[PDB]
Design a protein that fits this description.
The structure holds 2 protein chains of 2 kinds. Chain A has 3 helices and 5 strands. Chain A is α+β, with helices and mostly antiparallel strands. Classes of the chains: A alpha+beta, B mainly alpha. The complex binds flavin mononucleotide and chloride ion (3 copies). One chloride ion (CL) binds next to loops of chain A. The PDB classes it as signaling protein. The entry lists the keywords Protein binding, Protein engineering, Signaling protein, Photoswitch, Light-induced signal transduction, LOV2, Affibody, Complex.
Amino acid sequence: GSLATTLERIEKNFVITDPRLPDNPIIFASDSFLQLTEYSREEILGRNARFLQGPETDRATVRKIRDAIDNQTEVTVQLINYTKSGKKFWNLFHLQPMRDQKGDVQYFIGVQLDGTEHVRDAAEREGVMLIKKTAENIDEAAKEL
Amino acid sequence: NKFNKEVLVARQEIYWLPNLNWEQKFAFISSLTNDPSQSANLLAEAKKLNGAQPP
Ligand SMILES: Cc1cc2nc3c(=O)[nH]c(=O)nc-3n(C[C@H](O)[C@H](O)[C@H](O)COP(=O)(O)O)c2cc1C
Ligand SMILES: [Cl-]
Ligand SMILES: [Cl-]
Ligand SMILES: [Cl-]
């Protein structure tokens, strides 16, 4: 296999960032996230996740994420992102603070569910439900590894 | 490229350590992310923390 840490071999798209470092950069990126975005681990470690955004990315939506991060709360949005070679995809994204025992935020987990289109109605509610559950499982798993 | 193969290799090796809790592991990866030139020192020190916390 590759040089992923064991945590990064969990078969979901996510990255984990450290808000205690300047500009809240990625410290983990799953192999699945790397396959999705076409980036290698080498070129995105230590970088803010905002490199995923491009011309069509709604800036108000991105602001919704940053508001959540500043307040150390979770959020779910749908935004347009871009692969390394610049190919558009819809990203049903979920952010959630990773806390320790006493409830203090230590890191951020971010989960991506990729799609060719903006999901709406039932299909979006189903989507929101799923990635929240995935984010919960990833949190739980990281604490075991 | 700050995150050459050696850095990545050390990084993988820190996470293999059996006696570190998830915070301790996350902290070393984070320090390595922030200061890649200290990878070897970080792995060596992680191993000492590992050896000092037997089950
Ligand atoms: C854990 C985590 C995962 C993130 N994942 C994405 C992502 O997949 N796509 C994206 O466009 N932004 C993502 N972001 C958002 C950017 O990192 C950043 O928070 C956002 O662009 C707001 O910051 P800015 O206004 O300074 O650019 C993520 C942030 C965090 C903390
Ligand atoms: Cl591994
Ligand atoms: Cl694997
Ligand atoms: Cl950020």
